[PDB]
Subunit: 257 residues, 5 copies
């Protein structure tokens, strides 16, 4: 039972932070990148290296202690940080043609963010059920061929940063009543990134009943993926490249029964 | 004669489910994929195997037993499940260029969904009237050259899963008064998938008179196609890849005369 | 004519539902919905396309319930391209995209066009190349000059015959068509992907800025269409236009006029 | 100019309907609507395009019913359309096959679709890709160009006051002027970009500013301007020519009293 | 405390100007272009010359002295100047194919503008932390591998024209309360420019409380980047090409406490 919003100067708070991308970080110089992408010969032999696998980002943000009142998330401003880095087409890249600049970051992207009053709820789905996910990651267990389309056994919480690979988990549309999530997968090997920035855009997080995510235990959960595409090295080897995401959330106190 | 909506706590219900894709499933490891695509050498000799043909998906969901009242479908939330699986560019694929990642799923897609109070009504249309559709599928019978543009003999109901090939049937626009349907064919051999996910988007199913689909015999019909594109293996052979679709439908009791 | 009040009551509304088949050229008994393979002339001077290679506009004249002054006024339209999923047949006599791949799908230049009017669609002729010889059996801009490549006001016609007016040399005349509503999109490029949407939830309102729809002269409704979806490439590389049928549902009401 | 009330009554409205032909260069007696085939200089300093290779702005000055209280015709709405979009379906004439046995490559690549309605000539600012480009006799071009002309040289001010004379590539609408004109344009670059051309008789553009006032026609003349470079046509040899189309305009005007 | 707006003839003013692009200007004939782009052999050896690096544009515009009253920026009209120069495909470019016209300007673009009552606040982010930025530029200092995703040390003000390289700075979303900024990075090596011009479009600069940027010390700050793409010359070498941006801003006097 959601009751009235509290008013007064004391009745609002805001959270501001950024989430770093978790692309794999294959050495001490390659934060924000994955390891070079290799191709297994068969579905059966697919055994991706941990450093080759982008993972979901998550932060649990403690809010001011309330107690029954709960913090309600009302608005979000969000932004991908560092979009102009993609203008570095002069570093270790592959010339597009003789004497040309380096091919820029392009290809498959996944841009995703969520705000909730509890951990994002995940459903596991795998491209290839015979993929062996590596030690150090949290992945769909006991996968069967049905896991390639929908296996309801694969339920998890996004409760650990740099652990849940992007490719084998999505938000669970059968749950997540207390989260708002948004994402876009743009495929193709050459697809161009299109990255917009502005400080004038706000997303309202209220549902159809005028209620936003309610923060259980006075914690706010923010999640993100910003795989921007792949960087191609001079040899032609490709690595995922990601960027950080800014969040600013405005919250208000709501009485509940 | 549609009369008033019933109110009270007892007067609403919801259906939540998913429909798996039916892409052909050529072996025990390839759920969600078709058989590799082969090309006939003439129009006359076109004779696709069943496991090479994506089919429409359908589920008929029983609703709480009534009785006249009928359940009226009012809103829909829907989502393609497992969009991030398309980031697996590391297995059984063909490098985009020397030393690159595997070419991702791309090319022709068809994303389609419908919600109705009875089976989706279909009209048959064929690319090539001399195509021999295989045993175990339901296809336009007695096809003539006119069937390549419009032959009104080809009427059917989507009343069996894993049976009506996508390529030879479409929703019948002369019927379907009691269904709401939505589809997009995106062609081209290289077209990139663009897949959005969110739990914040609702489609209203009411017609211009404020009336949604009315569920005959207390059954709700959900139909879907989500052919995402084709997967290319190292040799260049291509197979369709599909994903499951989530549905959540809100219904209310309506009195009719 | 002064437009006066709309008539009401059960008897005052009617609806037309039909489909228009595409007229792509139909080069043999097996190839309804396709054109003949496209050949390229050596020079502008020698351009002489065969009739079976030229998509034409589709038109249907639909008789309405007899009136009488009352006229039927067309108010709304639902329309849809029929058979969009046929483009998923990439296993039939096509050219593989690469070694061992599926066939190249239908793609490239498309023209999707529809109109609803109370009289024939009015056409203006414009030619890519004024030296093109349009074939016997078509209706085309006559006495074409070099100015016909940009605008020659002599080239006026009515879309009054099916499978006769080639798409490439006629467009709706923007100086006329007061009693028609028309809509079209040319999407060019040899590789451009079709994007075809279907739904039974979309309605176009046909009323002008004064609240008046097309008024059906002689109790006839005119429907016109083109749905050239792109080109099909066969094994040899030869290309043919492929078209699809278009569904129309029009709601009409009786309107009194002076 | 104080803008006062609109006149009403049957006498107080008029309309202009016309078309503007494209001015692509017209290199011979058979090639109206096309430019000469494009050739490329070997250095910036030797860029010297021939007039027939250069698309120019189109303009028409349309006399209105004579009015002279001071009354002026006020342009209120516009309907506009590119004429002949389906000509781009001729892929069977003197073209270059896309692949063995294929149809001809259609018109594609860089396009500029532009139109304006004003109560006086469109005001232009000159900007050049390369300041050492020598524009040819019979065109009007930025004079005394310097290297700063490649980004902004305020000396280069002109009026679009002559048809088939102002090359498209070295002039744009001057955003520091044009108070009495409404203009709209889109440059879509790339050598392979597909034309996307929409036609309909159901679309109207309102020409009123934020104060409810449309272009006011000085001396009872209405100025219409356009460019509709649709892309390039590729001949069998590979040589490329710009192809343009005409533009239809219908403008509704009303009488407005001014002080 | 923002109080009432002043009214009357004297209470408004406007700024109209243009900002030239700062692409590098490698010689006396190449204003608006960068130096040809060269590619470093390794990430470690990336050492771009200043004339190869586009920089942010900025103008500080003095307003009529007020003193408490401040000028408040309310509306913006803006336009890229010279869009039709991209139609010069006859000036030492590289033919698209034998006998063809020159390839036009295409590939990565960044179009950005801002209006504020103080300098644009910047956050440094680098593609490659081992890039050595050149003398004469202002760049992220003490860069570490963390600078590739987010290093909060890299804070700056856009306070000097032709000095802050585009590729290593973005607007800081954690600041800029008194600025409105808007930008789009469109990547890919072949992406077509799409440039719209009109004198009929206005952007409102008021925030959700009805308050525009407030001009501290009676100065208005305008900033821009309009990298349109790369020009490829006959040799295959590629250079950035930029264009100027027009600004017209309307301001009103606002009382504050
Ligand atoms: K494995
Ligand atoms: K057969
Ligand atoms: K001829
Ligand atoms: K010169
Ligand atoms: K270095």
């Amino acid at each position: 039972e959601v009751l009235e919003v509290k008013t007064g100067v004391d009745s609002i708070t805001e959270v501001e932070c950024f989430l770093t991308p978790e692309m794999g970080d294959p050495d001490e110089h390659l934060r924000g990148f994955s390891k070079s992408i290799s191709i297994s010969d068969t579905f059966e032999s697919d055994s991706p290296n941990k450093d080759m696998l982008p993972c979901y980002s998550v932060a649990r943000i403690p809010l001011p202690n309330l107690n029954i009142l709960m913090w309600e998330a009302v608005t979000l401003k969000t932004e991908v940080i560092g979009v102009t880095t993609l203008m570095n087409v002069h570093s270790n890249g592959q010339a597009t043609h003789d004497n040309g600049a380096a091919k820029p970051v392009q290809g498959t992207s996944f841009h995703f963010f969520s705000v909730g009053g509890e951990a994002l709820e995940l459903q596991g789905v795998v491209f290839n059920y015979r993929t062996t996910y590596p030690d150090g990651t949290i992945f769909p267990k006991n996968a069967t061929v049905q896991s390639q389309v929908m296996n309801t056994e694969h339920k998890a919480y996004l409760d650990k940063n740099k652990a849940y690979p992007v490719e084998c988990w999505v938000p669970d549309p059968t749950r997540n009543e207390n989260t708002r999530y948004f994402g876009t997968l743009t495929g193709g090997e050459n697809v161009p990134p299109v990255l917009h920035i502005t400080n004038t855009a706000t997303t309202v997080l209220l549902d159809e009943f005028g209620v936003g995510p309610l923060c259980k235990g006075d914690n706010l959960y923010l999640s993100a993926v910003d795989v921007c595409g792949m960087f191609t090295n001079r040899s032609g080897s490709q690595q995922w490249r990601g960027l950080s995401r800014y969040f600013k959330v405005q919250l208000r106190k709501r009485r509940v029964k």
